[PDB]
């Protein structure tokens, strides 16, 4: 699994989308638990999200300081951002992600933890 040298800073149930820029539509990537893992050797924090039942990785990237969470016009319980290097699906790729939660509270809680994780990755 590669998650025993790692602390879980934050867990929340969430659904993750990628923007298909040629079709102009959001497409689901996975539904499951989104985890903030902080490696105990490097103190680097990644997002790691697995689908329910298949446990397949649908998100695997460092929470980079540069990233910015931006709202999506249709939703108050979602964030959008551009990720430069995700490895959930083979070799690293760029993606525009959207992640949506069950609640406006969880979305805002994610946002604060997300930027707490950015502070950590700076240091």
């Amino acid at each position: 699994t590669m998650e025993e040298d790692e602390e879980v800073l934050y867990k929340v149930r969430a659904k993750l989308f990628r923007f298909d820029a040629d079709a102009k539509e959001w497409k689901e990537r996975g539904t499951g638990d989104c985890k903030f893992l902080k490696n105990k050797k490097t103190n680097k924090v990644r997002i790691l999200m697995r689908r329910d039942k298949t446990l397949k990785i649908c998100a695997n990237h460092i929470i980079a300081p540069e990233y910015t969470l931006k709202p999506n016009v249709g939703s108050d319980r979602s964030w959008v951002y551009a990720c430069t290097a995700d490895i959930a699906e083979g070799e690293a790729e760029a993606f525009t992600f959207a992640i949506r939660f069950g609640s406006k509270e969880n979305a805002d809680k994610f946002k604060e933890e997300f930027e707490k994780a950015q502070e950590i990755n700076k240091k």
Partner: protein, 209 residues
């Protein structure tokens, strides 16, 4: 690694391609674009007996788009027969799909799947589905939309193809991912699409999640 050919058959519109695409990419395609002939798709699952690969042959259900028809079944090692619980006719032709299928594949594991069980107005109700009992098919209600039982057809086939009844899906290990820098030469391309992504609404905004 070892791989098995899987044929997926059933009437047009029953959700075969939706089901495959949900397993390939995680997405839920809402439009109906009838497939023409067959489209072949690798799909790998991680088990406690190593990785198992299915070469999924996703066939066409519409007769005009049928392509090579039973030609697609040759040397299939397993199969999924798909019908739609909101459409009685697609359950009525399940014995026709099974007929063509087993004339070419005499002794393979086969799942019967009644899809779309998430729709409230269900027409083929769970008492009427009995065709699998005498043909030794495994049967599952599924919903590619709600993902209800959506992994069980593959987990059942994996158990019978490997010959281990205790086979379970397991968490694939997650490599430590990199730290890549952004570049301003390709950014104004991505930041138009970042902008368009913010102004394109997310589907299904009344869902629980």
């Amino acid at each position: 690694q070892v791989q098995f050919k899987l044929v997926l058959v059933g009437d047009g519109g029953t959700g075969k391609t939706t089901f495959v695409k949900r397993h390939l990419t995680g997405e839920f395609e809402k439009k109906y674009v009838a497939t023409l002939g067959v489209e072949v798709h690798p799909l790998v699952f991680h088990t406690n007996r190593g990785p198992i690969k299915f070469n999924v042959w996703d066939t066409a259900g519409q007769e005009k788009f049928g392509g090579l028809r039973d030609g697609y079944y040759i040397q299939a090692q397993c199969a999924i027969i798909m019908f739609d619980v909101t459409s009685r006719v697609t359950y009525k032709n399940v014995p026709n799909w099974h007929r063509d299928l087993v004339r070419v594949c005499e002794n393979i594991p086969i799942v019967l799947c009644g899809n779309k069980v998430d729709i409230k107005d269900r027409k083929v109700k769970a008492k009427s589905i009995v065709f699998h009992r005498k043909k030794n098919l495994q049967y599952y209600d599924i919903s590619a939309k709600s993902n209800y039982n959506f992994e069980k057809p593959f987990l059942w086939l994996a158990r019978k193809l490997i010959g281990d009844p205790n086979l379970e899906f397991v968490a694939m290990p997650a490599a430590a991912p990199p730290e890549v820098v952004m570049d301003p030469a390709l950014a104004a391309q991505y930041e138009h699409d970042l902008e368009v992504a913010q102004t394109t609404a997310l589907p299904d905004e009344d869902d629980d999640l």
